Amino acid sequence: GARPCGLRELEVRVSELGLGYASDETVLFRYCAGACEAAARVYDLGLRRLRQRRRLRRERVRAQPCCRPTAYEDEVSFLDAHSRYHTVHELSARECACV
Amino acid sequence: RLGARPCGLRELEVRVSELGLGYASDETVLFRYCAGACEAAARVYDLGLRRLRQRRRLRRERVRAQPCCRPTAYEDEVSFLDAHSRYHTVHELSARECACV
Numbered sequence: 449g450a451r452p453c454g455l456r457e458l459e460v461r462v463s464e465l466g467l468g469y470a471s472d473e474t475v476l477f478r479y480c481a482g483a484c485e486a487a488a489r490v491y492d493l494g495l496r497r498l499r500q501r502r503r504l505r506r507e508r509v510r511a512q513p514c515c516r517p518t519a520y521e522d523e524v525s526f527l528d529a530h531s532r533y534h535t536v537h538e539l540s541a542r543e544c545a546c547v
Numbered sequence: 548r549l550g551a552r553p554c555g556l557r558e559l560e561v562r563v564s565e566l567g568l569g570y571a572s573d574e575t576v577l578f579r580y581c582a583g584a585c586e587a588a589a590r591v592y593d594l595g596l597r598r599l600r601q602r603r604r605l606r607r608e609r610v611r612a613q614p615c616c617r618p619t620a621y622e623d624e625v626s627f628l629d630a631h632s633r634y635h636t637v638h639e640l641s642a643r644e645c646a647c648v
Contacts, residue, residue: 467595483609
């Protein structure tokens with residue numbers, strides 16, 4: 449439990465993705481999930497202190513690392529409704545990191 | 548909120564003391580950071596990820612299904628003189644570049 453930020457796999461039906469595809473054919477879906485406890489960055493620390501001090505302009509400021517894809521899979525093909533092989537691009541994460 | 552302002556680089560003059568990094572310096576530095584809205588919106592990966600989270604198919608993990616305004620690059624270093632005339636170097640203090648991750 450509570451594992452670090454990394455690549456995750458899950459077999460899904462294309463219809464389950466909520467992309468508007470009728471097909472029930474399965475595709476392997478890859479995604480970034482996990483924890484970002486790689487010690488607070490000097491940038492993040494400085495930002496949090498300035499944030500509580502009302503020094504920062506009233507705006508949405510993220511002073512915490514995010515587990516997100518740094519690269520995406522080029523393409524995934526599945527048989528669609530019109531029975532043609534349809535390609536969806538950048539569906540799955542290829543690489544993950546804490547940004 | 549429509550028209551909140553896109554994710555981008557922001558600059559503000561600060562004393563090194565204000566950062567709370569433990570340095571005994573009153574030197575003014577230009578602090579560069581990433582702030583703003585990230586309404587990408589609806590990247591196929593994000594749309595699929597949000598939908599799978601609704602079905603509770605993601606193993607209970609944290610999962611970040613939305614883009615974040617974060618630095619993609621950091622300024623190499625900041626150098627200053629503390630009160631006791633001691634030279635200090637702070638690495639990766641400022642954002643060099645921003646993006647919706």
